[PDB]
Symmetry: C4
Subunit: 170 residues, 4 copies
């Protein structure tokens, strides 16, 4: 029932380059990659929205570096501002996650957590929720790409872009 | 089972002008219209209650127009105070909704979201919840009409009417 | 299955005066009365706890009477401090409730709202929850009686009794 | 199905001492003890985390002793700081719990409250949740032991240890 997921109006089965029938055996991992990217991009978009609203922690991210949370830029440079030891800690934690707790090798993406802890018994409701996850992931992928591109070209974070009234490109 | 919905005590099947039997084929769309109006009026009544409590966003609705959120009147003139571009954006978003996401042409009103996400498996509980939705929509329709009429006849918003002790018409 | 409800450890079927077998036909209304009193007393105990923590509304209960919410005593005189028109409004609203929406004549006490909106499908879980409701109602009945009696005897509300260290009767 | 609980990756059935087959009849109470310790240690770890974030009640724990809540140390001396009468009250309340409401003699640890009030109908989901409870209890046991040992050896509470940058032992 996985090959039926992600087929939603108005496009239906949208395979413009025709890879569903050309490479039928690769669809499992391609959908795994699509779902992984969708989840990551949804988290990233929520993160950007939180950042540019200046919802930051109170205190120091790295007291040894004298680096407060509010000192971290809200744009694409935020991850670069983090100290190298902090990036190492993030990488170690997500190595543990991605290799043990929710392995990326599990292509169905089903790690037992369900939707808010509970399995969706109704097949129609479960299919609709899975389609919602896929479509929101696709929208978030396009959105995070657009956010990063706009920040890189305009030169301003989303907060700075909105606060200066620079919404119109022309 | 749709024709049994909305039949509740103390009125039961209340058709004073006798259109259930006179026009049996029009009931589907008439109930669709009733449910749509009920949902819209419930949202409108909650909106009026929020407005007259002065629960407003902090900032500017339209910085180019120098129009803060608190500058928008809490009465029937609130929607008129919004800039034309903002009204255009609201209209475009709801055109997308009403034509694609939750089409108004779907007369059963079932867009797959269920009641707080989950389908109601028990037929009795589902019928009770649907009757609750219909009755609350009817009450909200009457309430929003009464609120608008009282504001237009007294010249005061609900907050101004209550704060001045003008809740007695005589 | 109603006659099995309220039978819980350590007392089991506790009928010290032997009215379950003496008047088997009166048990339905007696359990209705017990459940009604339990619900009312649970609400009353929560109300007293809220009052004596000075969690009060901000504003005037009756601006014509120049009576603020904080002016209402938190003890047994609180309901007496309310203006007569306010008591009339409360009585009218609860007449509507108790006669139409959740009639007191419905001895099973099942008004369709369920436990947090949902019916409890598991008979064991449902029986346990009903026993919990009954036992908490009994405890709240005893508690509200004790609170009122202690306030009347000591001359102080619960807040005044606790704040003065007058908890020990001797 | 209890003997299958707690068997999780990567260790599977981890019995280095070989007591599962040496003493098959003692496993019921040993798992009861393990689950009890897991729950107690999870509560203790949450408590330590709350303490060292200085999330304390506002007021006096014991006005007669002139002992505010903020005066109670956040480390291992917190339970020693509270007055003897308060310790007696805590002990009495938990005697009532552990002997009547959720008896420790019930080795299955099933007191009818379920997981957030509801029984888990799906056997796979229920087994996963029980394994989660056991593994989190084991992790919390190790964590609370480590927290207490680190505090007793460094001489500082967790807040004092973190605030001084004394996290690195060398
Ligand atoms: C998934 C993408 C992503 C990435 C790369 C970042 C990256 C960053 N976030 Mg962040 N964040 C995200 C998602 C993300 N966030 C989401 C989804 C939320 C909502 C819960 C937040 C909420 C958040 C707050 C409240 C703060 C940051 C902060 C930061 C910066 C310091 C690192 C830190 O303390 O993280 C903390 C990360 C979290 C609290 C949530 C991460 C949860 C992941 C997705 C799982 C860093 C640039 C801090 C900062 O310097 O602000 C500018 C800060 O104060 N983030
Ligand atoms: C995911 C959906 C999405 C949405 C809602 C937006 C929305 C927006 N983009 Mg955009 N963008 C997106 C995806 C998206 N983008 C993607 C995927 C890319 C990369 C191909 C871009 C690349 C891009 C550029 C290069 C620019 C915008 C700009 C803008 C803003 C002006 C609108 C516009 O160009 O008029 C129609 C607007 C906020 C402009 C901007 O930020 O204004 C200065 C601008 O210059 N976008
Ligand atoms: C459905 C009828 C309806 C209508 C016509 C309006 C119209 C309006 N609202 Mg509003 N509102 C509504 C329902 C409605 N509301 C509901 C149900 C809520 C509760 C969530 C709110 C909460 C709300 C806040 C908190 C604020 C407004 C504000 C406003 C005004 C500016 C537009 C705006 O920012 O909207 C924002 C709309 C929303 C946040 C919710 C709309 C959700 C719809 C129903 C879906 C405008 C007069 C702003 C204003 O100027 O205050 C006077 C403002 O600050 N509204
Ligand atoms: C939905 C239920 C509802 C409720 C609770 C109210 C409540 C109220 N209406 Mg009202 N009204 C309603 C529907 C409702 N209206 C409808 C549907 C209409 C249109 C026909 C009106 C038209 C209306 C007028 C024309 C006036 C009121 C007024 C009033 C207030 C005085 C009460 C009264 O007249 O004493 C009995 C009171 C707050 C009066 C007012 O403004 O308050 C001073 C007033 O003059 N109402
Ligand atoms: C069922 C017994 C009961 C009774 C007789 C009262 C009686 C009273 N309450 Mg009250 N209250 C109760 C339960 C009760 N309460 C519960 C369960 C809560 C928790 C939600 C509250 C929360 C509450 C607040 C926050 C306030 C009162 C206040 C008051 C006084 C003014 C009336 C008013 O505004 O009510 C309002 C009633 C409610 C908000 C909830 C009633 C819901 C019922 C049980 C259904 C009055 C003495 C006001 C006062 O003067 O404070 C001293 C005030 O500010 N009450
Ligand atoms: C529902 C359970 C319950 C609980 C927990 C309490 C708790 C309390 N009662 Mg009490 N009481 C209750 C029911 C309850 N009562 C009932 C049902 C009645 C009526 C028969 C009373 C009548 C009562 C009186 C007359 C007095 C107390 C007092 C007290 C306090 C001192 C304890 C005591 O006497 O030492 C054992 C204590 C807070 C005393 C008090 O408030 O201290 C001044 C006090 O004088 N109670
Ligand atoms: C299970 C282990 C455990 C132990 C031994 C303690 C012990 C203590 N806590 Mg505590 N606490 C715990 C778990 C624990 N807590 C958890 C899980 C929470 C989160 C809800 C809290 C939240 C908490 C607060 C907010 C406060 C304490 C405080 C205290 C101290 C005074 C006693 C008191 O008022 O308790 C109150 C206990 C609770 C409110 C929750 C206990 C619930 C149990 C686990 C059931 C005492 C050292 C007070 C203090 O002096 O701060 C330093 C204080 O203000 N605790
Ligand atoms: C991925 C999630 C994550 C987890 C689960 C996690 C857990 C723990 C634990 C418990 C096991 C401890 C004890 C601990 C301790 C410290 N952390 Mg964490 N930490 C995470 C992320 C980051 C990031 C992003 C940064 C960071 C930092 C520090 C500093 C530096 C203070 C200073 O330098 O004095 C110290 C002492 C910053 C950094 O090291 O900067 C040099 C920084 O940027 N940490 N950290
Ligand atoms: C229906 C819901 C809705 C959505 C989903 C939505 C999304 C976005 C997005 C993201 C796609 C952007 C980037 C964006 C941007 C701006 N909006 Mg929205 N907007 C919505 C509603 C309104 C309303 C009601 C108003 C309004 C306004 C502005 C202004 C004006 C600022 C200024 O003039 O400098 C700017 C820049 C106000 C207005 O245009 O007044 C002339 C105003 O009244 N918007 N808006
Ligand atoms: C039972 C729940 C309940 C409901 C559902 C409810 C609904 C409404 C509605 C909407 C239909 C209106 C329009 C309305 C209006 C007023 N109420 Mg309510 N009211 C309830 C309870 C009380 C209580 C307890 C009191 C009270 C009061 C007033 C005053 C007095 C202001 C003043 O005197 O200027 C006015 C104008 C106080 C009182 O009348 O004191 C003389 C007072 O004590 N109300 N009330
Ligand atoms: C285990 C949970 C628990 C419960 C369910 C519970 C219920 C009640 C009830 C309702 C039945 C009353 C009426 C009551 C009253 C007092 N309690 Mg509780 N109390 C609990 C725990 C503690 C702790 C830990 C302490 C404490 C205290 C006091 C004091 C002291 C004030 C003073 O000295 O002036 C008074 C009057 C402190 C203490 O006695 O210190 C000498 C203190 O440390 N209590 N307590």
């Amino acid at each position: 029932s996985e090959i039926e997921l992600g087929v939603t109006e108005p496009l239906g089965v949208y395979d413009p380059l025709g890879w569903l029938e050309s490479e039928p055996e690769a669809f499992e991992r391609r959908r795994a990659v699509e779902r992984k990217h969708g989840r990551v991009a949804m988290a990233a978009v929520v993160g950007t929205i939180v950042h540019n609203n200046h919802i930051v922690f109170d205190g120091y991210l790295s007291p040894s570096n004298n680096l407060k949370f509010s000192d971290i830029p809200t744009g694409v440079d935020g991850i670069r501002a983090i100290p190298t030891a902090g990036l190492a800690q993030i990488l170690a934690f997500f190595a543990l996650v991605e290799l043990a707790w929710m392995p990326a090798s599990k292509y169905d993406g089903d790690y037992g957590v369900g939707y808010f802890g509970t399995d969706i018994k109704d097949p129609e409701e479960k299919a609709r929720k899975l389609n919602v996850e896929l479509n929101n992931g696709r929208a978030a992928m396009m959105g995070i790409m657009g956010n990063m591109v706009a920040e890189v070209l305009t030169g301003q974070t989303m907060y700075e872009q909105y606060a200066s009234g620079h919404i119109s490109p022309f």
